[PDB]
Curated annotation (Swiss-Prot), chain B:
Entry's Gene Ontology cellular component terms: cytosol; extracellular exosome; nucleus
Effect of residue 38 to Q: Reduces affinity for substrate about 15-fold and reduces catalytic rate about 17-fold
Residues that hold Mg(2+) 3 according to the record: 99, 103, 153
Listed name of the protein: ADP-sugar pyrophosphatase
Organism for this UniProt entry: Homo sapiens (Human)
Binding site for Mg(2+) 1: 83, 103
């Protein structure tokens, strides 16, 4: 019943553009929407985000997250490791790459989502969420070597999976950080399960 | 270590703007970022709310109440938690209960409310509160709930059992052209991983 008629470019930067989308509403009346798109997509999706489950024997299972300065937020955020998928890279390969770059961990793929939307009222941005396990007892994960790209500046924060939401709430209370909505949604469901 | 130096307006729409952010990197070098922001945030603790609505009915498994709508940025239909922007002077809890009623018909009860969490922090400053709400599906108020959509809102309700949420979302994605929201997928994943 609803569909795009046309798009008008409002403004294009190097990395993002602003568009005005004309669409047909289900009554048959034409309407407009201001939308953002990245300029970088080719690709199943813009990005991957990695849910990294760090498994060490005789330890709690942890979820590995990253803290970075985020210029649109004007502050530090706690997020799943993540980045844009390179042209001709599969989402799986992007996930293992980004996790290795951002955390130094070498992980194994468990599952991969379809493309999911980031903020569909605002943007067309999509990611694959990739669940990866990390065998923390393997020598290659003993002293994990994070390889920042140019201008990345990433702190690794591992939190126990069994208490994730409480630990995130503490960091927020004590550290004036912003938690990512997908991290927080995952932490919620861990508590809400059963 | 890192902070904002300046924020230059590039293009301002009615609803969204593009900015050139200048910031200090942790090597002490000045850099830039193209950032997105809404034009609509005043003194609210966040742009918006998304509601995690847990429908509870005696001798039923608990459902997560989701909504499906056309999203012009995506050029298609999306399945999301019920959500909307916080009106000026409105509390996040009031916004969540109001949006839930407007989008689904249901009258909920507040369970918990997150701090402001970031939607897509590499792209935008957009934040929400994630508000968990229980819906007493045994109350006659919630028997034959009718959405009260606003002008240009056209929302379908989809309630799926919590205990099978990921597979039920996969089956919807298998059956039509639609995208699942990354917060919903995240939450459905954690329900599986717990
Ligand atoms: C980022 C949201 N953009 C919007 C919202 C409403 C309307 C009418 N147009 N554009
Ligand atoms: C929406 C992403 N904006 C960006 C990304 C990278 C750089 C250097 N600048 N701006
Ligand atoms: Cl897992
Ligand atoms: Mg990244
Ligand atoms: Mg990286
Ligand atoms: Mg809405
Ligand atoms: Mg609404």
């Amino acid at each position: 019943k609803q569909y795009i008629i046309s798009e008008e470019l409002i403004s294009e930067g190097k990395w993002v553009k602003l568009e005005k989308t004309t669409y047909m509403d289900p009554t048959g009346k034409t309407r407009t929407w201001e939308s953002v798109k990245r300029t970088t997509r080719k690709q199943t999706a813009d990005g991957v985000a990695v849910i990294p489950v760090l498994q060490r024997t005789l330890h709690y299972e942890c979820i590995v997250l990253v803290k970075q300065f985020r210029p649109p937020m004007g502050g530090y955020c706690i997020e799943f490791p993540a980045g844009l998928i390179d042209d001709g890279e599969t989402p799986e390969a992007a996930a293992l790459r980004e996790l290795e770059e951002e955390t130094g961990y070498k992980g194994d793929i468990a599952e991969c989502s379809p493309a999911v939307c980031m903020d569909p009222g605002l943007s067309n941005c999509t990611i694959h969420i990739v669940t990866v396990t990390i065998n923390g007892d393997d020598a290659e994960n003993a002293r994990p070597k994070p390889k920042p790209g140019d201008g990345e500046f990433v702190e690794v924060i591992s939190l126990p999976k069994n208490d994730l939401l409480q630990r995130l709430d503490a960091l927020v209370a004590e550290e004036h950080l912003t938690v990512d909505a997908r991290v927080y949604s995952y932490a919620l469901a861990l508590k809400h399960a059963n």
